[PDB]
Amino acid sequence: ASAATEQSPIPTSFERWAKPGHFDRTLARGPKTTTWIWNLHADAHDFDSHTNDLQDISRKIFSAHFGHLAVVFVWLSGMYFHGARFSNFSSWMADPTHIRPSAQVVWPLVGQDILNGDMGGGFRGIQITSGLFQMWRGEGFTNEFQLYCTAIGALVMAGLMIFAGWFHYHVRSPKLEWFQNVQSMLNHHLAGLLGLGSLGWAGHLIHVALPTNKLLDAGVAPQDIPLPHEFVLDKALMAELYPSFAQGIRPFFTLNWATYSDFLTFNGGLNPVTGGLWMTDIAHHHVAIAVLFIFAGHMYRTNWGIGHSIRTMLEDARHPKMLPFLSFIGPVGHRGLFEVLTTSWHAQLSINLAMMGSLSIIVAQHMYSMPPYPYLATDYG
Amino acid sequence: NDCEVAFGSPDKQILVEPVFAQWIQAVHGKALYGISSLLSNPDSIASTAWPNHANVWLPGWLEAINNGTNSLFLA
Ligand code: CLA
Ligand code: CLA
Ligand SMILES: CC1=C(/C=C/C(C)=C/C=C/C(C)=C/C=C/C=C(C)/C=C/C=C(C)/C=C/C2=C(C)CCCC2(C)C)C(C)(C)CCC1
Ligand SMILES: CC1=C(/C=C/C(C)=C/C=CC(/C)=C/C=C/C=C(C)/C=C\C=C(C)\C=C\C2=C(C)CCCC2(C)C)C(C)(C)CCC1
Ligand SMILES: CCCCCCCCCCCCO[C@@H]1O[C@H](CO)[C@@H](O[C@H]2O[C@H](CO)[C@@H](O)[C@H](O)[C@H]2O)[C@H](O)[C@H]1O
């Protein structure tokens, strides 16, 4: 307890598993025909039909989100494990222009090992086109043990995510007033999820990825490269690569930022060695958008007076307060939309799916033309 | 057969011969296979028309069915 918002019932019972259709009143009747079998999976996740309280539906949605995050962590663990056990990642790390990325080998069964093609270096496997190798090279991975460690960490995170979804429903589930705090959610997601996330990744890039990639582009063999923590540990090794790390974190507080202009570059092109974007330019990007997203997260009034109220901003966007040619939306405007979006989960899901699909399309159109990983643009598959 | 040929084994295909239609090809006088059936057998009851010997169609028809260049009873 810390915010006094939980005390959820629905005791973890086992008997409620041998009675399919328990969620719907007509689904728990008694099958009769076969349409029931198909109806079982047609509205299994539709928690809106099952019950009528918005708070119970919100609790169910929150725990379903946690279980989904667990599924995605299991998938990530599997991808890192495939790159750490059934891959030619080290071979590709040595020669990423003549070796074909492969992270899947087929068992020698009926006619089946013909799918294991020669990938260069004597490796008989399937050529993966997921871009995992190019991503791991840019992040800072050099050997497969680091990939195995990341796989174990993702599996641990998956177990942790399936405990957070059981603890936020079967032990201490939030109240509806917590879910309706869109101001706090926007503040935290904008400043703590996106802002601090990209700030932490900029820290990783400045201390792990930029070193490793600079040595890789220089010509150093992958197991001749120091491990990332030495880049973090001693500043002499890191100051050999960059001469702006000799002044430490002093030019930042005294606002002498052009001192840092050799690892926060603003080149804006492609690395000729790798083919990907300039790694220093990437780190500078993440620093700038961290400063932008954190600053954006202090916009909405939460518990301290300062901020906006989205309800006020919505209710004021109306004639005669609009631009004169935009005044056709009338004297009510967006008045009832804050209560639409804080009481309907479907309205929120519609907006978020539209933005998520549009942003995935934007991701597709920005990664062929500005290839953001080493040796990505040349692997056309 | 697709999965055998794709996995580099055209020899492991299941190839079943149409033995009944190959035999009906033989009962008309096709010597393409090793089936000495009715009109393929030159001194058979069907080929000779024993009491009558009036099948005056037999040599002309076997000049055409054995001719492996027309479409009459393709292999
Ligand atoms: C100790 C383990 C445990 C037990 C005994 C229960 C028991 C219960 N839970 Mg549950 N829960 C758990 C863990 C557990 N939970 C965890 C770890 C989470 C976080 C994800 C949840 C989150 C959760 C929610 C949101 C809800 C419940 C509900 C319920 C109750 C109804 C059961 C039911 O719906 O039939 C279902 C029987 C099943 C076998 C469900 C299987 C589905 C799972 C998630 C597997 C699907 C993932 C799939 C494999 C992904 C790959 C897809 C594949 C095709 C590729 C029941 C008493 C529901 C309730 O209260 O009913 C009113 C409710 O809505 N639980
Ligand atoms: C504008 C935001 C933005 C952009 C352009 C990037 C770009 C990049 N990131 Mg990322 N990142 C971001 C935000 C962003 N990041 C945030 C907020 C986090 C914390 C959650 C991260 C955490 C992160 C990790 C862990 C990693 C990266 C990596 C990368 C590089 C890989 C390619 C890629 O992601 O596709 C390009 C992405 C886009 C085209 C769109 C980004 C989607 C954001 C979330 C939308 C933000 C909305 C904002 C208002 C922008 C305006 C709308 C816009 C879509 C037009 C690339 C240069 C990888 C790397 O190795 O670097 C070399 C890597 O592993 N990032
Ligand atoms: C990849 C991956 C993974 C991993 C992850 C990780 C590894 C993590 C992390 C991490 C992180 C994420 C870290 C970070 C951090 C951080 C941050 C975020 C920071 C900050 C800060 C700040 C903001 C500052 C402030 C201040 C100022 C302003 C000045 C004065 C001082 C002070 C302090 C006050 C896993 C395995 C899970 C799974 C798979 C995937
Ligand atoms: C797109 C996508 C994806 C990916 C994702 C990712 C990769 C992500 C994320 C994310 C991230 C990247 C994140 C993050 C985060 C971070 C955070 C959230 C933080 C923080 C903070 C803090 C909490 C800190 C604290 C501290 C400490 C630690 C101590 C000292 C002080 C300080 C303050 C510094 C996938 C494909 C999978 C799927 C689909 C979608
Ligand atoms: C205006 C009234 C019309 C009424 C028509 C009624 C239909 C008439 C049917 C005519 C049928 C002819 O069918 C009969 O076939 C026999 C078959 O051996 C022919 O026989 C033929 O076979 C021998 C082979 O040994 C041939 O070498 C020869 O050219 C010929 O004789 C007869 O010559 C003919 O008489």
Side-chain angles (χ1 to χ4, degrees), chain A residues 72 75-76 192-193 196-198 200-201 356:
Chain A
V72 180
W75 170 75
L76 286 175
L193 183 60
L196 294 179
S198 86
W201 187 247
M356 185 64 73

Side-chain angles (χ1 to χ4, degrees), chain A residues 79-222:
Chain A
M79 301 289 103
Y80 278 98
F81 190 84
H82 283 255
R85 299 292 180 90
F86 314 102
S87 88
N88 55 355
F89 183 63
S90 297
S91 296
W92 184 89
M93 268 340 265
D95 202 16
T97 61
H98 312 306
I99 308 288
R100 284 173 190 272
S102 177
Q104 194 196 323
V105 296
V106 191
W107 282 332
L109 197 58
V110 292
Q112 200 188 58
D113 49 355
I114 197 166
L115 305 193
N116 290 329
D118 193 282
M119 295 297 148
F123 184 74
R124 234 74 215 317
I126 289 176
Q127 184 183 169
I128 64 153
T129 62
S130 61
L132 286 174
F133 285 14
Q134 286 87 334
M135 182 179 72
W136 299 337
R137 188 179 178 94
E139 288 172 349
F141 291 93
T142 53
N143 56 335
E144 296 174 355
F145 175 73
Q146 291 185 300
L147 295 173
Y148 178 79
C149 285
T150 305
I152 299 300
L155 206 46
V156 167
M157 277 296 251
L160 195 73
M161 288 287 134
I162 105 202
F163 159 86
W166 163 97
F167 169 98
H168 277 303
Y169 190 83
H170 281 110
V171 173
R172 181 176 294 181
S173 66
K175 292 301 262 173
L176 175 62
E177 299 62 284
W178 182 83
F179 287 102
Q180 299 209 116
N181 220 320
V182 294
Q183 313 277 28
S184 177
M185 214 181 309
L186 279 173
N187 274 8
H188 291 65
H189 285 170
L190 268 180
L193 183 60
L194 309 180
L196 294 179
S198 86
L199 190 59
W201 187 247
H204 170 80
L205 292 172
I206 285 169
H207 293 262
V208 170
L210 264 70
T212 311
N213 285 120
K214 183 175 174 66
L215 294 175
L216 274 178
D217 293 14
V220 191

Side-chain angles (χ1 to χ4, degrees), chain A residues 55-70:
Chain A
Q55 180 172 356
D56 191 8
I57 293 161
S58 308
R59 277 162 193 206
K60 285 179 173 173
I61 287 162
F62 193 57
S63 277
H65 284 184
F66 270 118
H68 178 262
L69 284 171

Side-chain angles (χ1 to χ4, degrees), chain A residues 256-269:
Chain A
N256 198 10
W257 285 355
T259 303
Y260 287 127
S261 66
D262 66 56
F263 66 101
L264 304 192
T265 64
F266 183 75
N267 304 132

